[PDB]
Amino acid sequence: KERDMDELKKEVSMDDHKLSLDELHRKYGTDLSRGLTPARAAEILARDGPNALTPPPTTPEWVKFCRQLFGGFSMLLWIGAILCFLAYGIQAATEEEPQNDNLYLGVVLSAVVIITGCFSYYQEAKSSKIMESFKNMVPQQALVIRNGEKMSINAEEVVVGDLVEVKGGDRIPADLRIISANGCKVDNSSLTGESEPQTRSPDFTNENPLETRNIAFFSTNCVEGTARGIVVYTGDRTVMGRIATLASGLEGGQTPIAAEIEHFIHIITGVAVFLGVSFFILSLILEYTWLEAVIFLIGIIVANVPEGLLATVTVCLTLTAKRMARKNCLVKNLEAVETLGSTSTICSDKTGTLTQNRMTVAHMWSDNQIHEADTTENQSGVSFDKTSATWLALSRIAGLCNRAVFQANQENLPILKRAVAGDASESALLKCIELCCGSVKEMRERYTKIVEIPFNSTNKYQLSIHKNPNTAEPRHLLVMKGAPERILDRCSSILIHGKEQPLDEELKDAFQNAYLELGGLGERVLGFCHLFLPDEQFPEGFQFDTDDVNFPLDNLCFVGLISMIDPPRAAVPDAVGKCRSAGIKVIMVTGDHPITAKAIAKGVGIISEGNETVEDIAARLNIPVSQVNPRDAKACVVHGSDLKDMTSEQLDDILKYHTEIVFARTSPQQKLIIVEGCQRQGAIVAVTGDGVNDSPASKKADIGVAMGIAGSDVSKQAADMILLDDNFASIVTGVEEGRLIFDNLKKSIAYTLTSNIPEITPFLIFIIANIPLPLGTVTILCIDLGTDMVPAISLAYEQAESDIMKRQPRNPKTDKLVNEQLISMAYGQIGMIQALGGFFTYFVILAENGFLPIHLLGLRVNWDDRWINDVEDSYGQQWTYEQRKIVEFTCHTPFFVTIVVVQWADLVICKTRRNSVFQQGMKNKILIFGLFEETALAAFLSYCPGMGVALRMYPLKPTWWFCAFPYSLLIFVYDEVRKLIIRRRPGGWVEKETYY
């Protein structure tokens, strides 16, 4: 009955916050100033559970090891091993002196699955191992008022309905119901995505518990001020608790690479069983009994299974995941390394993902001129002009008149990432002055503060007077900051290049348009002014006690505005542009305010400059918004309030007709609904986030991307890829590698699938033409799992043939990893030539040793006989059993060598899918070593002492090594003219039939 449990969690939360203080204390039974007796606290603590989310569901290591031993590819190898032991049991119980070929093959298939499981498991375990080294869960004790006294207890010992006090800096323990605040501002960024610190007031403000200010939330941090509140929700019943529990209990889906592997096996076994069955009937039609024909069916089906393609595909995926871990882009799931490339719609988060989630001084005003400050996370941008007197005055107004200072250990840390004590706005100002104006320590103590006035509840203004250390004037320096509407009313003089001027409207209106420019840009602006107090009316001995009008409120000298906002990360805009370049639809999904979300969207690239929303057109025409046709609006902003009242068809139309979409004020549950709406179209989805609200979105997405440091633990675990460096450009690297390894996997698969034809055709014509066996079993093992392993592994190292970040995302219903064109190439054209080359070397060996090829027909009848030691060749010679068997095995060895020789050309042509080898080039050193090792190993297997005894591989006469050369050269020339017609003629024949 867990379906209903998950459905009651996909719904946005309800509450009882809108209650009078008396109704609340009556419902919960709690003293508003004394809390409750510790007795009641322990009685609830041992009643419903400690205030902590239930730990994640532990995953034993034997379970995931058994997981790696299964899947889809390892399962095909399992059914192959089963068929091998079935054939061996049949052959054993029914005929005399049965052979151990099939048994050898079954144990080989079992070993293949075990080895693949051991290393794939070691890799996934290594990812989780280095992931556990990031859980730095430091216990945090809460301040609870019980029985009329203040005590600091563990966060888990907190219960429902008891007074809890929080101080600026402390973390909100459970979900509280504020009862009394003192200018308290909390941080709802990790939960509701609200960037700027939202204040918390005891009065109920909004019907939505998330938007209202009378509710403190789990995992939120009280930025500034102090407040009180009654615990309404505790443990897993909390807001972020229901979100995390929903995240763990969601479906992961089927990755694109996995679906491609499954469809690949569909074609492999399709042709495998077609061959096995048609040849089973063919063998019965010839002469072989049901006992023999059953072994033929099993042999042909089992022979058509790429035994080594499992290890090659695994190493391929592991190699690309290695490159991901090199750039601090760790993937938890191995196949998750491919999903980025196949993505065609990225749903991103604003706060903490698209942005830096930190107040930063954005723009400044001076000389009626806007100066943009550098807002990059690592300070690698344009520096404004810092040589004017207006700046030397404004910087002192900000560095002095501000309640912001660095803490103790803030020494070795950079100027931005260091911790600042106080308001977020004052922190941004302190960092900007400490960064672009030397230092604020000696600059603040240089002007000894006399009397200050903090921020006011009404007409919010902050002023202070300081002594003047200049060597030319002893007049007192008074400074004040505040909202521009509060400072314009108290100003008459204006600073410009060092001198003053009146409040003429020619430049005052120019100040108003600048205020609306920085404000309309989604930023928060402040005004800074100062004035020289006359030392004749207020001497150096007079003390301006903060009581009456000791300072002139008006007639001040305005220097300039200073705006601020959370800026996007450094490579975020460029990366968004790269994703749009690759044809990936970028859709912003955030719970922040739309006025800021739209500005960040236009600033990063989600909303292209020039495109207009459905509201922008109504504003440009001065007409109601209900009149404009939505088809004339490319982009659109969708509010969460309106999203709650939407159907499936409506969301489908929102995504179908609008190319640039921005979902604002959306709850985490709505984030999940949006991801589902994107998946309904049938496109690959990637969710990039950091907060707990991104957990149900990162889980249900085809691939989730969490920020490694600025992210929350729940969304980091529910994701499929972690960015340990928070460099969002890693998303671009990922979408590039995902396409790169996709094409390289195609090449490597066509390579392993090409060798199947010359591996099976010997047995096929052995059944048909009744000729001696041309190719042996152990030799086939030496090809699939011996030589070819290094070339197939090297095929992963191939680079881009054209620009992959230029082509559009692959269509999942069209561009299959193994389409019908690859089968027409490997099984149809190249493998066919390789099979003919093997048969040529075969007939050469037998014809030179006395058995003419025409004479080899119907010869296996007496050839395989172990007692007819007088088998006439074409010259009348009598061959014993072991003599002719020595020839057959020393005929299997060159067939194997022939395979390596034709694999040289097959590897060189598979390295390039469209380009010419002359164009791409043998710059792949792993491939060069692949051919050298392949050839040296093949020669060693034939000439090592004791191989005709152990592996029954006998030495070769040197002329055998040249029997395969013309076939390899032919393969190379044919595929080269193929890629040449593909280049010159990109229309359809060579392209839609062979280009795979």
């Binding site: 050193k925 792993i926 060069i928 070593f929 051919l931 050298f932 090792e933 050839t935 040296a936 190993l937 020669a939 060693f940 034939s942 000439y943 090592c944 002492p945 030495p955 070769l956 006469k957 040197p958």
Partner: protein
Amino acid sequence: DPFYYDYETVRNGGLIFAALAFIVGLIIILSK
């Protein structure tokens, strides 16, 4: 007699070829 083949010389040459091609390939993947 034509019923004899110097298999030891061919075998020795094949093993020397296998040794040289492998050490050369190792030099190939060690570009320094």
